[PDB]
């Protein structure tokens, strides 16, 4: 793997979005990975629809939270519309996926990253943006301003985010709380060495889409 990577710089990352006040991070996390792998494979960077997952992927619990596996599987089974055609409404509504006839993006599957292991995660991000989770309950995280975040934070993960890169000592994370949070929407989180739940539990549960 390269010493560092920034998928933003490689053009595989769309502008930061704002999920609030709907607790639909699961959808934002998944969509960002889809946006990323689509660019890597097809050369196209297009903002895709969190609202479709929200309205249509109902194994997850809408604004009350959801799952990486079910949301990734949704895109395998059904593909996903652009954000432009299916915009965010900040709340679950009727699944209108069938009513929309515009451009869609499909994936063919997804892979789970072996958990609690630095290099397994780093190796995955080297290839594509990855869906990851963090413990976001704390003042330090919620009011993060900038720099490499080393703590304080627990490992009781409750928020799904997107790993869009790393450096020697950190993982670059796209958050979904708008561009006014952290570093223009992003947080750089310390790389815990080796076997570890990771800083803020960032090694806990990681998945990435496959577009073959
Ligand atoms: C996170 C957010 O929008 O801030 C959102 O609550 C969420 O989807 N969180 C996930 C985090 C996991 C580590 C992937 C989550 O909690 N998913 C499980 C189901 C949601 C909670 N359960 C119920 N009963 N709603």
Ligand 1 centroid to 60 CA: how many Å?
A: 9
Residues 109 and 210: beta-carbon distance below 8 Å: yes
Stated in angstroms to one decimal place, the resolution of this structure is 2.1
Asked if residue 142 has its Cβ within 6 Å of ligand 1, the reply is no
Residues 200 and 141: beta-carbon distance below 8 Å: yes
CA distance 139 to 205: 22
Neighbours of 2 (CB within 10 A): 7
Indicate if 175 belongs to the active site: yes
Kindly name the residue from 25, 56, 153, 200 that is annotated as catalytic. 25
Q: Which two tokens stand for residue 48?
A: 């895709």
CA distance 25 to 53: 11
Residues 178 and 185: beta-carbon distance below 8 Å: yes
Q: How many separate domains does the chain show?
A: 1
CA distance 94 to 71: 17
CA distance 10 to 26: 24
Name the pairing type of β-strands 159-166 and 170-174.
antiparallel
Residues 208 and 48: beta-carbon distance below 8 Å: no
Cα 42 to Cα 61, 150, 192, distances in angstroms:
31, 36, 33
CATH number of domain containing 208 = 3.90.70.10
Cα 147 to Cα 45, 128, 151, 166, 186, distances in angstroms:
27, 23, 11, 13, 10
Kindly name the residue from 22, 56, 116, 175 that is annotated as catalytic. 175
- Token pair 């993060």 is found at 144
Burial of 160-189, coded b for 16+ CB within 10 Å and e otherwise, reads bbbbbbbeeebbbbbbbbeeebbeebbbbb
**Cα 69 to chain center, whole Å?**
12
Which range marks the domain in which residue 27 is found?
1-212
Q: What is the 3-state secondary structure (H, E, C) of the chain?
A: CCCCEECCCCCCCCCCCECCCCECHHHHHHHHHHHHHHHHHHCCCCCECHHHHHHHCCCCCCCECCCHHHHHHHHHHHCEEECCCCCCCCCCCCCCCCCCCCCEECCCEEEEECCCEHHHHHHHHHHCCEEEEECCCCHHHHCCCCCEECCCCCCCCCEEEEEEEECCCEEEEECCECCCCCECCEEEEECCCCECCCHHHCCCCEEEEECC
Q: Given the CA of residue 63, which atom of ligand 1 is nearest to it?
A: 3
Q: Residue 166's beta-bridge partner residues?
A: 5, 171
């Amino acid at each position: 793997y390269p010493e560092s990577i920034d998928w933003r710089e490689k053009g595989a990352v769309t502008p930061v979005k704002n999920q609030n006040p709907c607790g639909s991070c699961w959808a934002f996390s998944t969509v960002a990975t889809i946006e990323g792998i689509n660019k890597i494979i097809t050369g196209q960077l297009i903002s895709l629809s969190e609202q479709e997952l929200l309205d249509c992927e109902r194994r997850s619990h809408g604004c009350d939270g959801g799952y990486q596996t079910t949301s990734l599987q949704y895109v395998v089974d059904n593909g996903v519309h652009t954000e432009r055609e299916y915009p965010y409404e900040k709340k679950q509504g009727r699944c209108r996926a069938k009513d929309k006839k515009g451009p869609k993006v499909y994936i063919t599957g997804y892979k789970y990253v072996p958990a609690n292991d630095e290099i397994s995660l780093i190796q995955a991000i080297a290839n594509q943006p990855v869906s990851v989770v963090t413990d976001s309950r704390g003042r330090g995280f919620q009011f993060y301003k900038g720099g490499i975040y080393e703590g304080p934070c627990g490992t009781n993960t409750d928020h799904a985010v997107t790993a869009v890169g790393y450096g020697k000592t950190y993982l670059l994370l796209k958050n979904s709380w708008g561009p006014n949070w952290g570093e223009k929407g992003y947080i750089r989180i310390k790389r815990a060495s080796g076997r570890s739940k990771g800083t803020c539990g960032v090694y806990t549960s990681s998945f990435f889409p496959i577009k073959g």
